[PDB]
A = this chain, B = another copy of it.
C-alpha cells in the first residue's frame, strides 16, 4: 500500500543521500523497480538534480525514523513507489 505517492512543492530529506547519474531523469525511477531498497525519489517537472540537472536524479532513503528535514519552494516532485516503502521501518 504505497503504489504512487508523490508530494509536490516540498521534499523531505531523510538519511543517505546520493545523486544518481542516470539516462533521462524520469527513467531513473526504475532504480526502485529493480532494487527495492530506496525511498524518496526527487525530481522537478524539468530535470531532477534538486532543481535543475538533466542527466541526474535526487535519491535518499530513511532507514531510521529520523526527523524529516524538508527543503521548500524551489522543488518539484518527490515520491516513493512500489513495496520498498516498507524498508522505512524494516
**A interface, CB within 8 angstroms of B:** 13, 15-21, 47, 49-54, 56, 58, 60, 67, 69, 71-76
Could you tell me the dominant secondary structure of chain A's interface residues? strand
Query: CB distance B13 to A50 under 8 Å?
Result: no
**CB-nearest residue of chain B to A50:** B50
Q: With the chains together, A86 CA to B15 CA distance in Å?
A: 24
Instruction: Please state the number of chain copies in the assembly.
Output: 2
Query: CB distance A56 to B67 under 8 Å?
Result: no
Q: With the chains together, A16 CA to B20 CA distance in Å?
A: 21
* Known A17-B69, A19-B71, A76-B19; contact A51-B51, beta-carbon cutoff 8 A: no
Q: With the chains together, A60 CA to B13 CA distance in Å?
A: 12
